[PDB]
Paper text:
Ribonucleotide reductase (RNR) is a key enzyme in all domains of life, utilizing radical chemistry for the synthesis of deoxyribonucleotides by substitution of the 2′ OH-group of a ribose 5′phosphate with a hydrogen. The strictly aerobic class I RNRs are comprised of two homodimeric subunits: a large catalytic subunit R1, where ribonucleotide reduction takes place, and a small radical-generating subunit R2. R2a proteins utilize an oxygen-activated di-ferrous metal site to generate a stable FeIII/FeIII-tyrosyl radical (Y·) cofactor, whereas R2b proteins generate a MnIII/MnIII-Y·. R2c proteins generate a MnIV/FeIII cofactor and the recently discovered class R2d—a MnIV/MnIII cofactor. These dimetal centers reside in a ferritin-like scaffold, and are coordinated by two histidine residues and four carboxylate ligands.
In addition, we have introduced an R2lox-like L61G mutation in the second coordination sphere in close proximity to the N-terminal metal binding site (site 1) and investigated its effect on the structure and protein metallation. The structure of the metal-free L61G variant closely resembles the WT BaR2b. The structure of the putative superoxide passage to the metal in site 2 was not affected by the mutation. The substitution of Leu61 with Gly allows the Phe165 side chain, located on αE, to adopt an alternative conformation, occupying the vacant space, creating a larger hydrophobic cavity around the metal center. Interestingly, the distorted part of the αE (residue stretch 159–168), adopting a π/310-helical conformation in all L61G structures, has an increased B-factor for the Cα atoms, suggesting that the mutation has a destabilizing effect in this region. Additionally, the mutation renders a larger surface-connected cavity between helices αB (residues 46–76) and αD (residues 125–140), gated by Met1 and Glu127. Overall, in all structures reported in this study, the first 288 residues could be traced in the electron density, leaving the last 34 C-terminal residues disordered. The electron density is well-defined, except for a flexible poly-glutamate loop region E275–E278.
Author numbering:
A (entry chain B), B (entry chain A): 1 to 275, 279 to 288
Write the structure that this text describes.
């Protein structure tokens, strides 16, 4: 039974991604958020509610990626070096999820925080899309999986970390781009910095497994991937309308979602399927 | 579907163990090993061979813990804060496994390293020990598991990290306690510092599950736990004889194994079943 041996490369990219993930390591204790209170209070009730809701949805995303996605993808990988990288990525997803609670602690009372997480747990659209994603992971709860099943779980992973998250990243970035909630915005930028390389790395692994499939299996998962993309897209447009109508940002967020959908497709080596907001861009600075 | 909420504790210990794991974070680049060459060359061939073999055995252990044990235990947990800690621990197991390659890089040529890893992969006792432990993990590759199955996977985990590893930790510690290979010994001490709190944490989780089992189930897993303990012990006594007879350390290591078996049992809230070498103690200093 094989032990991991980093003195003999199993691929051409796991070492560089390992090094980069470690280089980018951070924890929430490093960013004090209390100074955000001064711009928090300038927001309206509806703006504050949108902010808490999208952070709640992001926390659900990281909870599923660290606790289900990365574990079940990595456990079936034969590349032990790539396995190491995914394990580190899953731990950093839990750092991300914890960093959202660090923001909440400064911005909300204990009762308001419990409102958030109860709204997350009972929200029908969050349940629907998190459930579509994790169904691909739960398919891996067996001793032997097919490469079709492992590939599609990787697709699901890229679509969550490169694509579905950005309906939520939009608003912290938009506010930070206007000088509001900028310390929380630095936390979100750290998270995004990790998520970007997570999506690139899983996409590379996916392309490698795709190339190992029979022609029939490739045709099947190419079609499934495009169906999944648009199933999630349809759900995400209902999500953005529910979250952002109150604050007049529905169509701006949708443009951001399509932009990042294109990046997730490219992370998978696939062509774009849709045609950055300058305030958001300023929040990424 | 629930997101992790750290502003409402799910238990009385996950936050403390989260903070400590993070506080203890390290990676191999922090410890240069080149200065160990000056005591490496003073060891005999038999001593150099034992050292390479036990580090190879240790790497296999961490490879299976980070890539199988932690993912398959954590994924079935209902406690999302505990899930977070385990994901971080599995990541640190991969840091540990990689640190062993960093030592090898200073001490062995590229060809000698590949010999090590081939000896690990084909070695019958290592295959047997890892095979027994991971069989408890692979039982968790299904959608629904029993608490007996999850409990015995946690037992397997404690027995590996608190107990089976120490037939290997003995020798780097014994040499470091004498001023030999002290930089590698510092790496081994950081690994042990992580492993100790790993076994404690998983042991706490096992005791929580144990208290939920029916009395009949409790007695069944107590019997399995005692049998597994002694089955592994019998294999380790053959392993120490194989590794350490050439260098006269067999009975010293056996005593170290019994000492750490007792610690693993205690991590599980169980009574000791066996009755530290002072140089090993100085290597831990």
């Amino acid at each position: 039974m094989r032990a991991v041996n980093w003195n003999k490369k199993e691929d051409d990219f796991s070492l560089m991604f390992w090094k980069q993930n470690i280089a980018q390591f951070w924890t929430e204790e490093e960013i004090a958020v209390s100074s955000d209170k001064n711009t928090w209070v300038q927001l309206s009730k509806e703006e504050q509610i949108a902010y808490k809701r999208v952070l709640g949805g992001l926390t659900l995303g990281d909870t599923k990626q660290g606790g289900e996605g990365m574990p079940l993808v990595l456990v079936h990988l034969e590349n032990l070096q790539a396995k190491s990288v995914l394990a580190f990525m899953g731990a950093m997803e839990e750092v991300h999820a914890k960093s959202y609670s660090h923001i909440f602690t400064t911005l909300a009372t204990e009762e308001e925080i419990d409102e958030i997480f109860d709204w997350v747990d009972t929200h029908p659209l969050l349940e629907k899309k998190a459930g579509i994603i994790t169904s691909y992971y739960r398919r891996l709860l067996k001793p032997e999986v097919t490469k079709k099943e492992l590939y599609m779980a990787m697709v699901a992973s890229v679509f969550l970390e490169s694509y579905l998250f950005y309906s939520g990243f939009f608003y912290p970035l938009y506010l930070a781009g206007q000088g509001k909630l900028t310390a929380s915005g630095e936390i979100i930028n750290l998270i995004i910095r990790d998520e970007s390389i997570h999506g690139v790395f899983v996409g590379i692994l996916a392309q490698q497994i795709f190339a190992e499939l029979s022609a029939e299996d490739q045709q099947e998962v190419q079609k499934e991937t495009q169906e999944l993309l648009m199933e999630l897209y349809e759900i995400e447009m209902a999500y953005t309308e529910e979250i952002y109508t109150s604050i007049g940002l529905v169509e701006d967020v949708n443009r951001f979602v399509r932009y990042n959908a294109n990046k997730g497709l490219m992370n998978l080596g696939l062509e774009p399927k849709f045609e950055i907001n300058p305030i958001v861009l300023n929040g990424l600075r």
